[PDB]
Design a protein around this ligand. Structure first.
Ligand SMILES: CC(C)CN(C[C@@H](O)[C@H](Cc1cc(F)cc(F)c1)NC(=O)O[C@H]1[C@H]2CO[C@H]3OC[C@@H]1[C@H]3C2)S(=O)(=O)c1ccc2nc(NC(C)C)oc2c1
Lengths: 99, 99
């Protein structure tokens, strides 16, 4: 699809057998999801944003369906206020900005 | 232009007579710039993001040139780690996501 930006660019994702909404976020390098149950091993990480830093769990080679498109990559899980799809996954679904 | 997302979507802006780089950020509702000298009245505001909240100065009807396109709107100035162009200005320059 083409998505205009009059409203937040929210999409449906499926990850770890669960359905969620997430924000298509060109300002995010990495993908950050709110606390959820994901299987397997993970590595501690801290990431920074507008108000300071959070500790996240890093999960690698995680399958995610983003608006009907499949991608595999790194997902960070932790206290983000909103689920964020970052450029690591936006590049895999062929997402571009146009003006 | 069309912009792919293999690198951060940085653009040149001109604001308050000054040249800066800023991130085209679909995950940002509002436009947040690092401390800079802007003329005129402003209103205190606090905004939230991944790591907590910052206090910003809100400036209204501010002219900004974003990659050659002119827009007028609200700009928040404060301790953001990076200059962010949010949807309030992305809608004015006709910016869309496509996949
Ligand atoms: C500051 C930006 C450069 C990076 N951020 C992405 C930005 O799009 C971020 C996404 C976001 C986070 C959040 F907690 C709540 C939201 F509603 C929206 N937006 C953001 O700070 O915007 C703030 C401000 C903008 O106006 C309004 O719209 C949303 C609120 C609010 C104030 S980030 O902090 O969430 C972020 C996300 C993914 C990242 N991956 C990394 N990876 C490496 C570099 C560590 O860093 C990340 C940093």
């Amino acid at each position: 699809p083409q998505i205009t930006l009059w409203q937040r660019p929210l999409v449906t994702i499926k990850i770890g057998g669960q359905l969620k909404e997430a924000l298509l976020d060109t300002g995010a390098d990495d993908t950050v999801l709110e606390e959820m149950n994901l299987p397997g091993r993970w590595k501690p990480k801290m990431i920074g944003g507008i108000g300071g830093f959070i500790k996240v769990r890093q999960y690698d080679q995680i399958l995610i369906e983003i608006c009907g498109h499949k991608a595999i990559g790194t997902v960070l899980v932790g206290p983000t206020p909103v689920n964020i799809i970052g450029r690591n996954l936006l590049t895999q679904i062929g997402c571009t900005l146009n003006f």
